[PDB]
């Protein structure tokens, strides 16, 4: 009997009464198509912003699309959020997650570049990395076609988006862009391997992400599990920026991201862990079907722009 809010319950109740085929049953044009729209019905409209405008740039494959978000149709030099979404690195897209974008701008004040970076099976690990990592360093060398100077980057994503941000952030920690990362956020991210942990087996069914959800998108990737590309609670956090972990209670991936907090505080990093109570995995994007998540989303708001400073 874990503790799960009212609201967060209810929706909970709805997908059990929907009682679908799980994703490795559908095509994958069909399991695609269905994250579109539970976000579609379950995430609180776009915010209207000054600048929504798809863009591109270069990637080791071929052009990477992507999007930029901004309450401000003139900016001055700042730090410029890059975004990467979930999905497992097999479906969403610049779609699922507009509407997150568009309210992280909103909040933020800051611009956001959405990443929308190959996906597996078609394109397995490591095309997603690096495509965010092309898309981050693109963005931190403040190209014309952006319209803004990026004085640093905020790489942030949510489940698969919050691994490829925690990644990205090592591989340019290791080899910096023009700019350096001021602060990184990982939203209940993909750190550690999840098998053998004790919240995978607690939330395997029944509270949004299931393990054979998991178990689908990791065999769609095909990441190593030595490999710090796949799983960077393996890389080295001694440099590590600051670092803003949110994770939900509920998660059956919750404890990878206490893991990667932990041993952030073990290399001595700043690092602000928040464990939202009573909501799930996907809390970012179920904000009118859910409406308490808007309130964990504002607390991590709230929590960059204090470690901003
Ligand atoms: C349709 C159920 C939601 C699954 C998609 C999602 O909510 O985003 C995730 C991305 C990556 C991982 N993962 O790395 O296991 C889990 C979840
Ligand atoms: C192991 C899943 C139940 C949660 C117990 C804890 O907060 O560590
Ligand atoms: C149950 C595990 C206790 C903490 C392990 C650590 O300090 O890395």
Known sequence: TPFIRPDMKAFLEAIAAMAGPTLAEMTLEEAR???????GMADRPARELAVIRNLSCPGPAGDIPLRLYDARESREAGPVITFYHGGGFVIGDLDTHH???T????????????????????????????????????????????????????????????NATIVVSQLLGAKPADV???????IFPLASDAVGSASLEAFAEGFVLTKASIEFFDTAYKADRADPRGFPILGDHTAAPPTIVATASLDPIRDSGRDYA???????????????????????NIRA????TQ???????????????
């Not at 932990?262 to 970012?284: C, I, N, Q, W």
């Not at 309130?295 to 400073?309: S, V, Y």
């Open 103 to 162: 309210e992280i701008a909103a909040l933020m004040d800051l611009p956001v570049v959405a990443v929308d970076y190959r996906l597996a099976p078609e394109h397995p690990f490591p095309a997603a990395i690096e495509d965010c990592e092309a898309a981050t360093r693109w963005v931190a060398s403040s190209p014309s076609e952006l319209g803004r100077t990026a004085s640093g980057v905020i790489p942030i994503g949510d489940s698969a988006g919050g």
């Open 33 to 39: 198509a269905s994250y579109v729209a539970l976000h």
């Open 99 to 101: 509407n997150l974008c």
């Open 289 to 292: 079907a859910v409406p308490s």
């Open 262 to 284: 932990k041993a952030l505080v073990e290399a001595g990093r700043d690092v602000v862990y928040l464990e939202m109570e009573g909501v799930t995995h996907s809390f970012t």
């Open 295 to 309: 309130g964990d989303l504002e607390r991590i708001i709230a929590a960059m722009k204090m470690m901003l400073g």
């Open 180 to 186: 350096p990362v001021v602060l990184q956020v990982p």
